Design a protein around this ligand. Structure first.
Ligand SMILES: Cc1cc2nc3c(=O)[nH]c(=O)nc-3n(C[C@H](O)[C@H](O)[C@H](O)COP(=O)(O)O)c2cc1C
Ligand SMILES: Cc1cc2nc3c(=O)[nH]c(=O)nc-3n(C[C@H](O)[C@H](O)[C@H](O)COP(=O)(O)O)c2cc1C
Ligand SMILES: Nc1ncnc2c1ncn2[C@@H]1O[C@H](COP(=O)(O)OP(=O)(O)OP(=O)(O)O)[C@@H](O)[C@H]1O
Ligand SMILES: Nc1ncnc2c1ncn2[C@@H]1O[C@H](COP(=O)(O)OP(=O)(O)OP(=O)(O)O)[C@@H](O)[C@H]1O
Ligand SMILES: [Mg+2]
Ligand SMILES: [Mg+2]
Ligand SMILES: [Mg+2]
Ligand SMILES: [Mg+2]
Lengths: 350, 350
């Protein structure tokens, strides 16, 4: 048996009668599927527990995810190998706590609402990967550190300091947040983890055998930024949003790193400095994407690699062969330094 | 009227009779103080709401904070200017939810326990400054970005890469976490905010008129690390834990920066790169603390300033006069580079 617990937000005001109707239809369908559970609502939040055979639960959950009446759905707990039902008599019991005025329920209602409001704010400041660990029954704070091979991804906005000097503060934050949204969506789609934002820079990582996905994510980010620049409104600062990207591979420490007050689940190791140094090299090259030979040698697809004769690294141990991809993007550029001049002239005049 | 809502963890197993006795004594004292509220417990967690005149609530709360029977106390909500009691008939009503088996309470119990467990994990990955904003009734996600003057603090471990190469992974993480705990405790004590960990580096900030506190925090960190090095056990890697510190002042953007998936409440601006560049300069100087003339000129105490003739910055706009403090610490050092050699020889032999 499987049991799922999730919370969600009303997409729109729902009357008491609409909530009842959801419970009625839910009861009718769940009974046929030998599914049981409970549905609670409180001040625009749904809480639901569903239990039954895993095959049936998975299908019902997918349907519920498509329901336009709620949004921001977060699974808090996914129990598998369950051997005893919690709510055996309830195909779907619906409890509208807004309408309840029992005396002993009152203080529990207040606490649940206060905790939920706080939880839903903290979710926005937490990486989603933490939630999947929690939902599976593991406390991420107890994960022991391990050494593991990763592909490290660094991307950094070109000449961001210019934006900050020429634009109102709200517009500056809008540009950087737009950049982070573009990169996060594509990295996550390719199976990477965005682990930290460092000013105008994205730090992410992929599994050590996922060089092909790291390369593809990088190429797709560069293409998305070109579309964004070309399709932005007249006078928009997004027209001069450019990035570099550097990739490196190596053994890093993955674990909980920080103080008693605040920790991060993240990585530590030399491959991080190598990726950051390679990203910085793009300011001196025509190419916006650079990566080390270890990344090139770990790829399995027949990428259009180009070997670059600009291995002037610093801080390394024995230098590094540098590669890029030769396509329409990394080829037709004004290079770096020329781009930085272009950004200042454009922003001076808007 | 004031109303406080907090959660805490049992410091030790408490029997049902001990919880009742807490409620009895609480009832007797609260009645005299015209305080009302409710006390709930569930699987080793306390939840309490207290309401009454602010003067009385503050005193009672301080006493409760000293009670050895609970720990990890977090105030979730602090309401001031309250005009109506929630629980007027209850000096302190005690509800042991572990012992309750009402039927309708059952699903609420499960949700509350699931949400609380998740909340308490997320607290460890969140900066405490976020919680104080929430508890005051403000949603930090809705704070608009603003330009503000700050003192930016950077500190970075000397030759950390050596630790990572020579020690088992668990010991490496122990060293960096010990360093972060030392810095966080002192920065917070002096009114600073630790905003990000970047590998082996602490990024923090102070209000723009708090140069004296930023300097004092830096000096106290250097003194604490010397005590730690001298008092560590034979063979401990903490014996060769050294740091640099750089401070700079300038106008930065403070606000929510990130993606729809994850954001940070943090700062952005040129003063950050200046502080990071100054910290890096300590590797070439005998001094472990460097700061810009804007920090020196904003201090109000008669510090023992020394003007350093090593202003060879890069990436700035018009260079920078560099200062330190001339005391026993910044004076008697082997300088940088010499320290890096010392660390490798020591760790090679343990
Ligand atoms: C919070 C919420 C919870 C729901 N829970 C269930 C459920 O447990 N079982 C179910 O069949 N439908 C549930 N639904 C409804 C489905 O999303 C969908 O409307 C319904 O299954 C379609 O039924 P129909 O195709 O027979 O019209 C829920 C909807 C919402 C907004
Ligand atoms: C969760 C918890 C909640 C408490 N709540 C109250 C309260 O509301 N009012 C109160 O006077 N003491 C409360 N106490 C007890 C105080 O910490 C302290 O033991 C008590 O006030 C001392 O009483 P006495 O000095 O008369 O012996 C609480 C203790 C715990 C562990
Ligand atoms: N060493 C650093 N550590 C942390 N954050 C930094 C560091 N250097 C810069 N930043 C952050 O990044 C922002 C942009 O600085 P950055 O060096 O990327 O300049 P830029 O104008 O974007 O130029 P470039 O094209 O070289 O990236 C700074 O405002 C600061 O917020
Ligand atoms: N540019 C960077 N951005 C983010 N994290 C970095 C960067 N460079 C290094 N790190 C992180 O910091 C860790 C330590 O690198 P660092 O440059 O501090 O070397 P070090 O051996 O401690 O020497 P130093 O005395 O110069 O600080 C690296 O393992 C990586 O986790
Ligand atoms: Mg940049
Ligand atoms: Mg940057
Ligand atoms: Mg270091
Ligand atoms: Mg570092």
């Amino acid at each position: 048996m499987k049991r799922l617990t999730y919370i969600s937000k009303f997409s729109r005001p729902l009357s008491g009668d609409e909530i009842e109707a959801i419970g009625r239809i839910s009861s009718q369908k769940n009974q046929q599927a030998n599914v049981t559970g409970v549905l609670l609502c409180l001040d625009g939040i749904f809480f639901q527990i569903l239990e039954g055979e895993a095959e049936k639960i998975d299908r019902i959950y997918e349907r519920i995810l498509a329901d336009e009446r709620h949004t921001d759905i977060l699974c808090l707990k996914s129990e598998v190998e369950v051997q005893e039902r919690m709510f055996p008599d309830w195909s779907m019991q619906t409890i509208n706590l807004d309408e309840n005025t029992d005396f002993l329920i009152r203080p529990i209602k207040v606490l649940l609402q206060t905790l939920t409001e706080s939880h839903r704010i903290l979710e926005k400041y937490t990486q989603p990967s933490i939630f999947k660990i929690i939902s599976q029954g593991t406390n991420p704070l107890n994960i022991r550190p391990k050494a593991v091979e990763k592909i490290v991804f660094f991307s950094d906005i070109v000449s961001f300091s210019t934006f900050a000097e020429k634009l109102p503060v709200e517009e500056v934050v809008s540009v950087v947040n737009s950049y982070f949204s573009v990169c996060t969506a594509i990295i996550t789609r390719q199976g990477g983890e965005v682990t930290k934002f460092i000013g105008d820079c994205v730090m992410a990582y992929f599994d050590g055998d996922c060089a092909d996905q790291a390369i593809q994510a990088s190429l797709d980010i560069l293409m998305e930024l070109e579309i964004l620049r070309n399709s932005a409104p007249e006078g928009s600062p997004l027209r001069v949003l450019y990035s570099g990207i550097g990739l490196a591979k190596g053994k890093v420490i993955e674990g909980n790193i920080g103080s008693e007050l605040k920790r991060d689940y993240t990585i530590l190791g030399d491959a991080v400095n190598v990726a950051a140094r390679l990203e910085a090299l793009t300011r001196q090259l025509s190419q916006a994407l650079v990566f080390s030979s270890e990344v090139k040698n770990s790829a399995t697809k027949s990428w259009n690699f180009i070997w670059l004769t600009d291995s002037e690294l610093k801080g390394k141990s024995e230098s590094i062969d540098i590669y890029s991809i030769d396509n329409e993007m990394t080829r037709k550029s004004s290079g770096g330094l020329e781009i930085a001049r272009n950004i200042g002239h454009y922003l001076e005049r808007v």
